[PDB]
């Protein structure tokens, strides 16, 4: 209206002086992450599994197997998760580190109760299931991962590649993840255990996705992320996902860790990355601003992914003209509704980089589009208020 | 205007009562799929090929080779297509089931008239082209697929891996798809046919995409989707696509099905998934509502992909104020133009899951954006009508 230190933009008349404004934007502050109000938020994979990480649960560590509660919203904290100690593993030679983050994307996750393969009847038999006391079970003694069976032949000879088929062994509509691997040691020890001293070749096919691996015999890297025990050998661990009703095929040679108890999961869980522990309660979970409580319809700052009762990002501080018409369209602007953005829940940081880059490009473009729409709406509203 | 049981929304004044409205939305009902009006719609791959499926045509079945008519709009009916019966195939060990759906995305599809490789001059010669009476040709007798040549060596010895190059053998600008595979049987039969009883290793490279395969000798899964004949062995079949002017490389051992007649195709065909048979005529093809005839500019319901003279999805039942200005605003809203959304036509369901998930995410985001724009337009229009 008349002269005043408050200015508001209009779609047609541009800048104009008004005798009071109602701010609609606020810049938040980075804060810790809190439990989402009204939804059970997944932090640690198994909260009641003590002294175990997500990779320990995913690989089935002997002393921390337990039920994984279902969750609709989940938090990603470790981009490169680590183990808390069992038989040493070459983590970087495969894609195994992303398995906990893959299971994090499924709402319902459970471990099978029956073995999908009878390890004593697999080709290359007779087998004896060896074990090592690197990671022990409930009673102090030798153990191994619950999702594998270290098969050591009773007859010590070299073999040609052998084939085994992994069937679908749980309810339809649940994608099944099969975890397998192979074990290698130095020359004399492999000559004593398997009867041959040459590298062995492994491969696996599932849904048209094929991988190939060759073992190493000799100098090994120093043990890392394991319960400190002097051991001369170490294992390579991989996983393959099978969809509904689809079987898998594995070709192998001496030193195979045959799968025993597979993970198969269903549903979809909203995944956003953050940090632990979850402290308190928050209306919205912002990927860069931590746990935020919604107080105003819009916010200004660094745009990022969010889950929950969140405000909508804008690029400039918007103001609504002031001084029942003002209240009539104040709720209308506050009642705008936009769908939220999350990770793809199936695109891994290590494996799928171009897809994630395209995803962030789409996120930025949508942010700009909705910001422009909101600015146009605010100009229309306050232009109507002024007139 | 005055008091009335009809209410309309406005961008500025909010809810307002008017004496009559013009509905702009309608909820369709699920119906069968109909031929698209004005465009030749592709259903079956070869409609005049009787007693044959899409995979039978793609693999080149002896008794139903025929011309594939060109089409701009195509229908996908089998997510996991099956064969109607020839020599048994290990369907799930490769990506072969998606070949008909890959050919479905090309407007012009044809089979070559000359062999891209002279099978009798390939490395490992002398060869004799073996054949089996599992699927016969026009006159009852032994035959085989038109896109392969089962090369059985005349000299029965084991061989080291051999290399052959697949040249570009059709018009430039047409992507060429090469179909190849290998054959395996049990121990004594392979010792009698090929001279060796060890698994054979195969690989192929094209455009930097490489696959590796190892054959199986011994227990085979039960025959499925074949013309019932007792066969002790079965084959694995794969395909590789070469772009314009690019050759391919194949490494192989005993038991190779060398390519003979490749598919090369050009153009782009709009692919939407549905069900057969096509009954009648429809203005628009909705992926979930079947064949729909456009009657109103907008519709409310489950948003999905559509091809043709289709209405635009909205989330709420919009209404237009009533009671020549009204007529002018009705045509303007009815003449809005939005381009339609289809499948990627190159992303396979079995192989590319993250890309399809990102595609559906983009689909939903565009649906929300367009719905918001349409709602804003309707509020502006009826606000102008009231004033």
């Amino acid at each position: 209206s008349s002269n005043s230190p408050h200015v508001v933009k209009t779609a047609t008349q541009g800048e104009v002086n008004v005798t009071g404004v109602i701010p609609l934007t606020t810049t938040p502050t980075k804060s810790h992450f809190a439990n989402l109000k009204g939804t059970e938020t997944r932090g640690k994979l198994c909260p009641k599994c003590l002294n175990c990480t997500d990779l320990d649960v995913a690989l089935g560590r002997p002393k921390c197997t337990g039920k994984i509660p279902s969750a609709r919203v989940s938090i990603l904290h470790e981009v490169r998760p680590v183990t808390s100690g069992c038989f040493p593993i070459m983590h970087d030679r495969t894609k195994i580190r992303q398995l906990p983050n893959l299971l994090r994307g499924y709402e319902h996750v459970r471990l099978s109760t029956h073995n999908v393969i009878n390890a004593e009847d697999a080709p290359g038999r007779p087998y004896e299931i060896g074990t090592s006391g690197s990671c022990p079970n409930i009673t102090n003694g030798n153990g191994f991962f619950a999702t594998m069976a270290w098969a050591v032949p009773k007859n010590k000879t070299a073999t040609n590649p052998l084939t085994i088929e992994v069937p679908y062994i749980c309810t339809e509509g649940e994608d099944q993840i099969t975890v397998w691997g192979f074990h290698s040691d130095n020359e004399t020890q492999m000559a004593k255990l398997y009867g041959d001293s040459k590298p062995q070749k492994f491969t696996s096919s599932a849904n048209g996705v094929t991988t190939h691996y060759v073992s190493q015999i000799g100098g090994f890297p120093n043990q890392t992320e394991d319960g400190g025990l002097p051991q001369s050998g170490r294992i390579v661990v991989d996983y393959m996902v099978q969809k509904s009703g689809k079987t898998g095929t594995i070709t192998y040679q001496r030193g195979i860790l045959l799968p025993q108890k597979v993970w198969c999961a269903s549903g979809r869980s909203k995944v956003i990355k953050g940090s632990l522990p979850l402290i308190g309660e928050a209306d919205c979970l912002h990927e860069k601003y931590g746990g935020l409580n919604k107080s105003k319809p819009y916010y200004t700052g660094e745009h990022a992914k969010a889950i929950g009762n969140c405000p909508i990002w804008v690029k400039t501080p918007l103001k609504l003209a002031n001084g029942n018409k003002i209240t009539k369209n104040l709720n209308s602007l506050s009642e705008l509704e936009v769908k939220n953005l999350q990770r793809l829940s199936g695109a891994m940081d290590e494996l799928h980089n171009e897809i994630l880059e395209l995803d962030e490009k789409v996120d930025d473009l949508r942010a700009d589009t909705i910001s422009s729409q909101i600015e146009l709406a605010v100009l229309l509203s306050n232009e109507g208020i002024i007139n | 205007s005055s008091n009335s049981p009809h209410v309309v929304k406005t961008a500025t004044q909010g809810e307002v009562n008017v004496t009559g409205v013009i509905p702009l939305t309608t909820t369709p009902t699920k119906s069968h799929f109909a031929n698209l009006k004005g465009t030749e719609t592709r259903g079956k791959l070869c409609p005049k090929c009787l007693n044959c499926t899409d995979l039978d045509v793609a693999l080149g079945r002896p008794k139903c080779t025929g011309k594939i008519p060109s089409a701009r709009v195509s229908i996908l009916h089998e997510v996991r297509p099956v064969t109607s019966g020839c020599f048994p195939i290990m369907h799930d060990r490769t990506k072969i089931r998606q070949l008909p759906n890959l050919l479905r995305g090309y407007e012009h599809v044809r089979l070559s008239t000359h062999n891209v490789i002279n099978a009798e001059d390939a490395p490992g010669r002398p060869y004799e082209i073996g054949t089996s009476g599992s699927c016969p040709n026009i006159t009852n007798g032994n035959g085989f697929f038109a896109t392969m040549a089962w090369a059985v060596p005349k000299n029965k010895t084991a061989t080291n891996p051999l290399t052959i190059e697949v040249p570009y053998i059709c018009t430039e600008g047409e992507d060429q798809i090469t179909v190849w595979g290998f054959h395996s049987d049990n121990e004594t039969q392979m010792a009698k046919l090929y001279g060796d009883s060890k698994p054979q290793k195969f690989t192929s490279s094209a455009n930097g995409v490489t696959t590796h395969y190892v054959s199986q000798i011994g227990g085979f899964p039960n025959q499925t989707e074949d013309g019932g004949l007792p066969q002790s062995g079965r084959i694995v079949v794969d395909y590789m696509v070469q772009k314009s002017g690019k050759t391919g490389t194949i490494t192989y051992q005993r038991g190779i099905l060398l390519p003979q007649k490749v598919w090369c195709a050009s153009g782009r065909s709009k692919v939407i998934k549905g069900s057969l048979p096509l009954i009648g005529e429809a203005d628009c093809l909705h992926e979930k509502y079947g064949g729909l005839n456009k009657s109103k500019p907008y519709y409310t319901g489950e948003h999905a992909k559509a091809i043709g003279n289709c209405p635009i999805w909205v989330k709420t039942p919009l209404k237009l104020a009533n009671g020549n200005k009204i007529t002018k605003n009705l045509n303007s809203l009815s003449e809005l133009e939005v381009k339609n959304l289809q499948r990627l036509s190159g992303a396979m369901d079995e192989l590319h899951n993250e890309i399809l998930e990102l595609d559906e995410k983009v689909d939903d985001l565009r649906a929300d954006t367009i719905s918001s724009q349409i709602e804003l337009a309707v509020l502006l229009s009826n606000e102008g009508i009231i004033n």
Partner: nanobody
Amino acid sequence: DVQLVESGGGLVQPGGSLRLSCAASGLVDSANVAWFRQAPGKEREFVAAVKWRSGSTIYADSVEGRFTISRDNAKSTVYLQMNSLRPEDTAVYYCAANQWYSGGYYGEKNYDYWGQGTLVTVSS
């Protein structure tokens, strides 16, 4: 988690009235609640929906000017008032809700929390 329980079903002559009820505990200021129905031999279809915060109503064409939906956050219950029932309305009704706004107000994948169901029969 939230709890959804439906009550008020029964048998009514065609031309009368009926009211349904649904008690929800644990809803937040951004939730949405909807009613469904499934005729025998058919799939569930959208009937109505209201917003837990502002109370905006979305009613399907088949049942409009006759049905109505409302909520009372003081009593934590949502009602469905039925007028001029016809024998084509006989079905099993359901109460559905979600925590925050989803892709659309129609369909079953948009809503996450589902109620057990009540039986409504219309006959002369």
